Paper text:
αHBs are oligomers of 5 or more α-helical peptides that assemble into coiled-coil structures with central solvent-accessible channels. We targeted two properties of αHBs: oligomeric state, which directly affects the internal diameter of the channel; and the identities of channel-facing residues, which fine tune this dimension and introduce different chemistries. The αHBs are loaded with an environment sensitive dye (in this case, 1,6-diphenyl-1,3,5-hexatriene, DPH) that binds within the channels and fluoresces. Accordingly, challenging the array with analytes leads to differential displacement of the dye across the array to give a fluorescent fingerprint.
Despite the requirements for aliphatic residues at a and d, up to 40% of these can be changed to other side chains without compromising barrel integrity. We introduced mutations at one or two of these sites to generate four groups of αHB: Group I had entirely hydrophobic interiors, but with different sizes and shapes of channel; Groups II and III had polar uncharged or polar charged residues, respectively, at specific points along the channel; and Group IV had aromatic residues installed in their channels. The eleven Group II peptides comprised: single mutants to Cys, His, Asn, Ser or Thr at d sites; and double mutations to His, Asn, Ser or Thr at consecutive a and d sites. Finally, one third of the designs were crystallized and yielded 12 X-ray crystal structures, all of which were open αHBs with fully accessible channels. Focusing on the small molecules, the αSA signal from the more-polar AAs and CHOs is dominated by the polar and charged Group II and III αHBs.
Numbering used by the authors:
A (entry chain B), B (entry chain A), C (entry chain B), D (entry chain A), E (entry chain B), F (entry chain A), ...: 1 to 30
Write the structure that this text describes.
Amino acid sequence: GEIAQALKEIAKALKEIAWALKENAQALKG
Amino acid sequence: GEIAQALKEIAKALKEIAWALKENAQALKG
Amino acid sequence: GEIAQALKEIAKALKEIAWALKENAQALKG
Amino acid sequence: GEIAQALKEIAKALKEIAWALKENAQALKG
Amino acid sequence: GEIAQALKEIAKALKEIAWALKENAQALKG
Amino acid sequence: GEIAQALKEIAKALKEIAWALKENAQALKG
Amino acid sequence: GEIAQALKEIAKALKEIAWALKENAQALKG
Amino acid sequence: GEIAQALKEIAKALKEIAWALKENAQALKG
């Protein structure tokens, strides 16, 4: 269904936020 | 449907936050 | 509809968060 | 309706987070 | 209604996040 | 109801994030 | 119910974010 | 159900954000 699909897209976007925050951690290390 | 479309716009906005955080990581790396 | 409109306003606010985080990245650069 | 009104209050609160993050960018620029 | 009330409590909590981020900005200033 | 109760638990968790961010501001002030 | 349970899991995850932010505050102190 | 499953994926993504923030704390500690 379209609502579950859209919530799955929000989950994917939050995972992209996590990946970006890992990039910040690496930049501080470095 | 309009609710699914609005949730997809929230996902796009969260991807924009992810990209902004990537930009911060690049700024720290410099 | 009013719920979809309100979700669209949440998306716009998350885009404002992204813009603010870009301003942080620029301040670090710088 | 009260649910749409409450979602609009969440959007306003997210704009407040955006403004706080702008304040952080200004503090770093100084 | 209880759902609208609970969403209003989430809005209040996001405003508390904004206030905490302002405190961070002040600490950097500083 | 159980959905309202779960949304109230999300609000409490967001207040915990706010308090953690206050802690970060205090750490920067030191 | 499964939706309330899933919202409770989102609350637990936001509490984990709060704990991680406390770890950041401690690292700055340090 | 598919909505509960999608909300569980959002919770997992928020745990990924928590772990990324832990990584940032470790980077600052070094």
